[PDB]
Amino acid sequence: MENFQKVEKIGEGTYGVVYKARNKLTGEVVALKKIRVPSTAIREISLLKELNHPNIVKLLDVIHTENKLYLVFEFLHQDLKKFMDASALTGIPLPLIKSYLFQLLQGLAFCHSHRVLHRDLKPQNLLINTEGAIKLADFGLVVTLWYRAPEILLGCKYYSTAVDIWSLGCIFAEMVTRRALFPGDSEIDQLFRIFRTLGTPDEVVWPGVTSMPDYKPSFPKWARQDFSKVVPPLDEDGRSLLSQMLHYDPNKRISAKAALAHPFFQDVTKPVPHLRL
Ligand SMILES: CN1CCN(c2cccc3nc(-c4n[nH]c5cc(-c6ccc(N)cc6)ccc45)[nH]c23)CC1
Protein backbone atom coordinates (compact mmCIF):
# COMPACT_ATOMS: atom_id res chain seq x y z
CA MET A 1 0.00 0.00 0.00
CA GLU A 2 3.05 2.20 0.35
CA ASN A 3 3.07 1.55 -3.38
CA PHE A 4 0.21 4.02 -3.78
CA GLN A 5 -0.27 7.74 -3.52
CA LYS A 6 -3.81 8.96 -3.00
CA VAL A 7 -4.76 11.75 -5.35
CA GLU A 8 -8.32 12.46 -4.24
CA LYS A 9 -11.31 10.91 -2.54
CA ILE A 10 -13.62 9.57 -5.28
CA GLY A 11 -16.41 7.91 -3.34
CA GLU A 12 -17.70 6.85 0.06
CA GLY A 13 -19.81 3.79 0.84
CA THR A 14 -20.89 1.61 3.77
CA TYR A 15 -18.20 -0.93 2.96
CA GLY A 16 -15.28 1.37 2.29
CA VAL A 17 -13.98 4.50 0.66
CA VAL A 18 -12.67 4.95 -2.89
CA TYR A 19 -9.71 7.08 -3.90
CA LYS A 20 -8.10 8.02 -7.17
CA ALA A 21 -4.51 7.01 -6.61
CA ARG A 22 -1.26 6.60 -8.49
CA ASN A 23 0.87 3.48 -8.37
CA LYS A 24 4.28 4.89 -7.43
CA LEU A 25 5.62 1.97 -9.42
CA THR A 26 3.42 0.98 -12.38
CA GLY A 27 2.84 4.72 -12.79
CA GLU A 28 -0.80 3.92 -13.45
CA VAL A 29 -3.71 5.92 -12.15
CA VAL A 30 -6.24 3.61 -10.54
CA ALA A 31 -9.31 3.59 -8.29
CA LEU A 32 -8.34 2.30 -4.88
CA LYS A 33 -11.06 0.95 -2.63
CA LYS A 34 -10.17 0.73 1.08
CA ILE A 35 -12.29 -1.94 2.80
CA ARG A 36 -12.54 -1.38 6.55
CA VAL A 37 -11.69 -10.34 7.68
CA PRO A 38 -13.34 -13.54 6.31
CA SER A 39 -11.15 -15.97 4.40
CA THR A 40 -14.21 -16.99 2.40
CA ALA A 41 -14.43 -13.39 1.23
CA ILE A 42 -10.75 -13.50 0.27
CA ARG A 43 -11.64 -16.36 -2.09
CA GLU A 44 -14.89 -14.71 -3.20
CA ILE A 45 -12.92 -11.64 -4.24
CA SER A 46 -10.13 -13.77 -5.71
CA LEU A 47 -12.77 -15.07 -8.10
CA LEU A 48 -13.97 -11.65 -9.18
CA LYS A 49 -10.42 -11.03 -10.43
CA GLU A 50 -10.91 -13.58 -13.20
CA LEU A 51 -14.32 -12.25 -14.14
CA ASN A 52 -12.87 -10.09 -16.89
CA HIS A 53 -14.99 -8.40 -19.60
CA PRO A 54 -14.92 -5.14 -21.66
CA ASN A 55 -18.03 -3.92 -19.83
CA ILE A 56 -16.91 -4.79 -16.34
CA VAL A 57 -14.51 -2.46 -14.53
CA LYS A 58 -11.24 -4.37 -14.13
CA LEU A 59 -10.07 -5.55 -10.74
CA LEU A 60 -6.34 -5.05 -11.27
CA ASP A 61 -5.16 -6.31 -7.89
CA VAL A 62 -6.28 -7.31 -4.41
CA ILE A 63 -4.10 -6.25 -1.48
CA HIS A 64 -4.63 -7.84 1.90
CA THR A 65 -2.47 -6.36 4.64
CA GLU A 66 -3.25 -6.15 8.35
CA ASN A 67 -6.87 -5.41 9.23
CA LYS A 68 -7.42 -3.69 5.89
CA LEU A 69 -8.34 -4.91 2.44
CA TYR A 70 -7.54 -2.80 -0.62
CA LEU A 71 -8.99 -3.39 -4.06
CA VAL A 72 -7.24 -1.74 -6.99
CA PHE A 73 -9.50 -1.05 -9.94
CA GLU A 74 -9.14 0.30 -13.40
CA PHE A 75 -9.90 4.04 -13.30
CA LEU A 76 -12.62 5.62 -15.46
CA HIS A 77 -13.30 9.32 -15.66
CA GLN A 78 -17.03 9.71 -15.12
CA ASP A 79 -20.13 8.00 -13.78
CA LEU A 80 -23.47 7.74 -15.59
CA LYS A 81 -25.15 9.76 -12.85
CA LYS A 82 -22.95 12.79 -13.53
CA PHE A 83 -23.42 12.36 -17.27
CA MET A 84 -27.21 12.15 -16.83
CA ASP A 85 -27.09 15.28 -14.69
CA ALA A 86 -24.98 17.03 -17.33
CA SER A 87 -27.36 15.95 -20.11
CA ALA A 88 -30.52 16.81 -18.20
CA LEU A 89 -31.62 19.79 -20.33
CA THR A 90 -31.00 18.17 -23.71
CA GLY A 91 -31.36 14.50 -22.82
CA ILE A 92 -28.99 11.72 -23.85
CA PRO A 93 -29.56 11.02 -27.54
CA LEU A 94 -31.40 7.75 -28.10
CA PRO A 95 -28.58 6.11 -30.07
CA LEU A 96 -26.28 6.60 -27.09
CA ILE A 97 -28.89 5.37 -24.61
CA LYS A 98 -29.30 2.26 -26.78
CA SER A 99 -25.54 1.67 -26.97
CA TYR A 100 -25.11 1.98 -23.21
CA LEU A 101 -28.08 -0.35 -22.57
CA PHE A 102 -26.75 -2.91 -25.05
CA GLN A 103 -23.24 -2.84 -23.56
CA LEU A 104 -24.61 -3.23 -20.05
CA LEU A 105 -26.71 -6.22 -21.13
CA GLN A 106 -23.49 -7.71 -22.55
CA GLY A 107 -21.75 -7.19 -19.22
CA LEU A 108 -24.67 -8.72 -17.39
CA ALA A 109 -25.02 -11.66 -19.79
CA PHE A 110 -21.37 -12.43 -19.01
CA CYS A 111 -21.67 -12.09 -15.22
CA HIS A 112 -24.87 -14.03 -15.15
CA SER A 113 -23.44 -16.85 -17.26
CA HIS A 114 -20.91 -17.20 -14.45
CA ARG A 115 -23.70 -17.13 -11.88
CA VAL A 116 -22.43 -13.80 -10.57
CA LEU A 117 -25.03 -11.15 -9.62
CA HIS A 118 -24.38 -7.45 -9.26
CA ARG A 119 -27.28 -6.90 -6.82
CA ASP A 120 -26.94 -3.10 -6.64
CA LEU A 121 -26.86 -1.52 -10.09
CA LYS A 122 -27.39 2.22 -10.18
CA PRO A 123 -26.19 5.20 -12.24
CA GLN A 124 -23.51 5.97 -9.65
CA ASN A 125 -21.72 2.67 -10.22
CA LEU A 126 -21.97 2.68 -13.99
CA LEU A 127 -18.78 4.21 -15.34
CA ILE A 128 -18.15 5.67 -18.81
CA ASN A 129 -15.17 6.71 -20.90
CA THR A 130 -14.40 8.97 -23.83
CA GLU A 131 -14.52 6.03 -26.20
CA GLY A 132 -18.24 5.38 -25.82
CA ALA A 133 -17.83 2.51 -23.35
CA ILE A 134 -19.91 1.97 -20.22
CA LYS A 135 -18.90 -0.49 -17.53
CA LEU A 136 -20.29 -2.28 -14.47
CA ALA A 137 -18.63 -1.37 -11.17
CA ASP A 138 -19.12 -1.79 -7.44
CA PHE A 139 -20.45 -5.29 -7.49
CA GLY A 140 -22.43 -5.95 -4.35
CA LEU A 141 -21.49 -9.06 -2.40
CA VAL A 142 -28.26 6.16 3.17
CA VAL A 143 -28.90 3.22 0.81
CA THR A 144 -30.76 4.04 -2.43
CA LEU A 145 -33.76 1.82 -3.04
CA TRP A 146 -34.82 3.27 -6.37
CA TYR A 147 -33.44 0.36 -8.47
CA ARG A 148 -34.36 -2.52 -6.17
CA ALA A 149 -36.31 -5.44 -7.63
CA PRO A 150 -39.71 -6.19 -6.07
CA GLU A 151 -38.70 -9.74 -5.02
CA ILE A 152 -35.91 -8.25 -2.87
CA LEU A 153 -38.29 -5.74 -1.26
CA LEU A 154 -40.80 -8.54 -0.50
CA GLY A 155 -38.16 -10.50 1.41
CA CYS A 156 -37.11 -13.16 -1.09
CA LYS A 157 -33.86 -14.50 0.30
CA TYR A 158 -32.53 -16.48 -2.66
CA TYR A 159 -33.19 -14.10 -5.52
CA SER A 160 -31.76 -14.37 -9.01
CA THR A 161 -29.88 -12.67 -11.80
CA ALA A 162 -33.30 -11.22 -12.69
CA VAL A 163 -32.79 -8.54 -10.02
CA ASP A 164 -30.05 -6.94 -12.17
CA ILE A 165 -32.36 -6.84 -15.22
CA TRP A 166 -34.96 -5.02 -13.15
CA SER A 167 -32.39 -2.43 -11.99
CA LEU A 168 -31.15 -1.88 -15.52
CA GLY A 169 -34.75 -1.44 -16.71
CA CYS A 170 -35.19 1.34 -14.17
CA ILE A 171 -31.95 2.96 -15.32
CA PHE A 172 -33.05 2.63 -18.99
CA ALA A 173 -36.30 4.45 -18.14
CA GLU A 174 -34.38 7.13 -16.31
CA MET A 175 -32.02 7.84 -19.20
CA VAL A 176 -35.00 8.27 -21.51
CA THR A 177 -37.23 10.45 -19.33
CA ARG A 178 -34.59 12.24 -17.29
CA ARG A 179 -36.40 11.31 -14.12
CA ALA A 180 -36.03 8.39 -11.72
CA LEU A 181 -38.71 5.78 -12.46
CA PHE A 182 -39.40 4.72 -8.84
CA PRO A 183 -37.81 7.20 -6.41
CA GLY A 184 -38.79 5.65 -3.06
CA ASP A 185 -37.45 6.84 0.25
CA SER A 186 -38.35 3.76 2.28
CA GLU A 187 -38.81 0.10 1.43
CA ILE A 188 -42.57 0.37 1.59
CA ASP A 189 -42.67 3.67 -0.37
CA GLN A 190 -40.43 2.01 -2.99
CA LEU A 191 -42.77 -0.97 -3.15
CA PHE A 192 -45.88 1.22 -3.29
CA ARG A 193 -44.42 3.46 -6.02
CA ILE A 194 -43.83 0.28 -8.04
CA PHE A 195 -47.37 -0.94 -7.32
CA ARG A 196 -48.93 2.40 -8.29
CA THR A 197 -47.24 2.30 -11.70
CA LEU A 198 -47.26 -1.37 -12.67
CA GLY A 199 -50.25 -2.38 -10.53
CA THR A 200 -50.34 -4.32 -7.28
CA PRO A 201 -49.00 -7.76 -8.11
CA ASP A 202 -51.19 -10.79 -7.49
CA GLU A 203 -51.18 -14.52 -8.16
CA VAL A 204 -52.35 -13.93 -11.72
CA VAL A 205 -49.27 -12.07 -12.92
CA TRP A 206 -46.86 -13.41 -10.29
CA PRO A 207 -47.52 -16.96 -9.07
CA GLY A 208 -46.30 -17.31 -5.49
CA VAL A 209 -46.21 -13.59 -4.75
CA THR A 210 -48.75 -13.80 -1.91
CA SER A 211 -46.55 -16.24 0.01
CA MET A 212 -43.43 -14.10 -0.07
CA PRO A 213 -42.03 -13.22 3.40
CA ASP A 214 -43.03 -9.51 3.44
CA TYR A 215 -46.13 -9.72 1.26
CA LYS A 216 -49.24 -8.45 3.13
CA PRO A 217 -52.81 -9.18 2.04
CA SER A 218 -53.50 -5.68 3.32
CA PHE A 219 -51.38 -4.15 0.55
CA PRO A 220 -53.50 -1.61 -1.31
CA LYS A 221 -54.72 -2.76 -4.73
CA TRP A 222 -53.74 -0.30 -7.45
CA ALA A 223 -54.39 -0.77 -11.19
CA ARG A 224 -51.56 -0.89 -13.70
CA GLN A 225 -50.82 2.43 -15.41
CA ASP A 226 -50.57 2.74 -19.18
CA PHE A 227 -47.00 2.17 -20.22
CA SER A 228 -47.13 4.96 -22.82
CA LYS A 229 -47.59 7.31 -19.87
CA VAL A 230 -44.53 5.94 -18.08
CA VAL A 231 -41.69 6.51 -20.58
CA PRO A 232 -43.59 8.60 -23.15
CA PRO A 233 -40.85 9.65 -25.55
CA LEU A 234 -39.74 6.03 -26.02
CA ASP A 235 -40.66 4.14 -29.18
CA GLU A 236 -42.64 0.91 -29.20
CA ASP A 237 -39.57 -1.35 -29.51
CA GLY A 238 -38.00 0.37 -26.47
CA ARG A 239 -41.26 0.22 -24.46
CA SER A 240 -41.67 -3.42 -25.38
CA LEU A 241 -38.17 -4.26 -24.13
CA LEU A 242 -38.60 -2.17 -21.00
CA SER A 243 -41.88 -3.94 -20.12
CA GLN A 244 -40.11 -7.31 -20.32
CA MET A 245 -37.26 -6.06 -18.08
CA LEU A 246 -39.88 -4.90 -15.56
CA HIS A 247 -42.00 -8.05 -15.35
CA TYR A 248 -42.99 -8.77 -11.77
CA ASP A 249 -42.35 -12.50 -12.00
CA PRO A 250 -38.56 -12.94 -11.95
CA ASN A 251 -39.07 -16.04 -14.09
CA LYS A 252 -40.98 -14.10 -16.72
CA ARG A 253 -38.52 -11.21 -16.61
CA ILE A 254 -36.34 -11.18 -19.72
CA SER A 255 -32.77 -12.52 -19.46
CA ALA A 256 -29.75 -10.41 -20.45
CA LYS A 257 -28.99 -12.84 -23.26
CA ALA A 258 -32.56 -12.70 -24.64
CA ALA A 259 -32.70 -8.91 -24.30
CA LEU A 260 -29.65 -8.60 -26.54
CA ALA A 261 -31.70 -10.21 -29.35
CA HIS A 262 -34.59 -7.78 -28.93
CA PRO A 263 -35.67 -5.80 -32.07
CA PHE A 264 -34.80 -2.57 -30.24
CA PHE A 265 -31.15 -3.42 -30.85
CA GLN A 266 -31.43 -4.02 -34.58
CA ASP A 267 -29.98 -0.57 -35.36
CA VAL A 268 -27.64 -0.33 -32.36
CA THR A 269 -24.41 1.62 -32.88
CA LYS A 270 -21.63 3.00 -30.70
CA PRO A 271 -21.73 6.76 -30.57
CA VAL A 272 -19.13 8.68 -28.62
CA PRO A 273 -20.39 10.84 -25.79
CA HIS A 274 -19.30 14.40 -25.19
CA LEU A 275 -17.66 14.24 -21.78
CA ARG A 276 -16.52 17.28 -19.89
CA LEU A 277 -13.75 15.99 -17.61
C1 LIG B 1 -20.66 8.03 -6.41
N1 LIG B 1 -19.74 8.33 -7.53
C2 LIG B 1 -18.84 7.18 -7.81
C3 LIG B 1 -18.02 7.54 -9.02
N2 LIG B 1 -17.28 8.73 -8.68
C4 LIG B 1 -16.36 8.98 -9.70
C5 LIG B 1 -16.20 10.21 -10.28
C6 LIG B 1 -15.29 10.45 -11.28
C7 LIG B 1 -14.47 9.47 -11.78
C8 LIG B 1 -14.60 8.22 -11.21
N3 LIG B 1 -13.93 7.07 -11.49
C9 LIG B 1 -14.41 6.16 -10.68
C10 LIG B 1 -13.96 4.75 -10.67
N4 LIG B 1 -13.03 4.29 -11.51
N5 LIG B 1 -12.94 2.99 -11.21
C11 LIG B 1 -13.78 2.59 -10.22
C12 LIG B 1 -13.98 1.34 -9.68
C13 LIG B 1 -14.92 1.28 -8.67
C14 LIG B 1 -15.25 -0.01 -8.12
C15 LIG B 1 -15.61 -0.20 -6.81
C16 LIG B 1 -15.97 -1.45 -6.36
C17 LIG B 1 -15.96 -2.53 -7.21
N6 LIG B 1 -16.33 -3.81 -6.76
C18 LIG B 1 -15.59 -2.34 -8.53
C19 LIG B 1 -15.25 -1.09 -8.97
C20 LIG B 1 -15.60 2.40 -8.27
C21 LIG B 1 -15.41 3.64 -8.82
C22 LIG B 1 -14.47 3.72 -9.83
N7 LIG B 1 -15.39 6.69 -9.89
C23 LIG B 1 -15.53 8.01 -10.21
C24 LIG B 1 -18.12 9.88 -8.49
C25 LIG B 1 -19.03 9.62 -7.31
Swiss-Prot record:
Cited InterPro entries: CDK, Kinase-like_dom_sf, Prot_kinase_dom, Protein_kinase_ATP_BS, Ser/Thr_kinase_AS
Keywords: Acetylation, ATP-binding, Cell cycle, Cell division, Cytoplasm, Cytoskeleton, DNA damage, DNA repair, Endosome, Kinase, Magnesium, Meiosis, Metal-binding, Mitosis, Nucleotide-binding, Nucleus, Phosphoprotein, S-nitrosylation, Serine/threonine-protein kinase, Transferase
Lineage: superkingdom: Eukaryota
Modifications after synthesis and translation: Phosphorylated on Thr-14 and Tyr-15 during S and G2 phases before being dephosphorylated by CDC25A.
Cellular component GO terms, alphabetical: Cajal body; centrosome; chromosome, telomeric region; condensed chromosome; cyclin A1-CDK2 complex; cyclin A2-CDK2 complex; cyclin E1-CDK2 complex; cyclin E2-CDK2 complex
Biological process per Gene Ontology, one example term: chromatin remodeling
Protein's UniProt name: Cyclin-dependent kinase 2
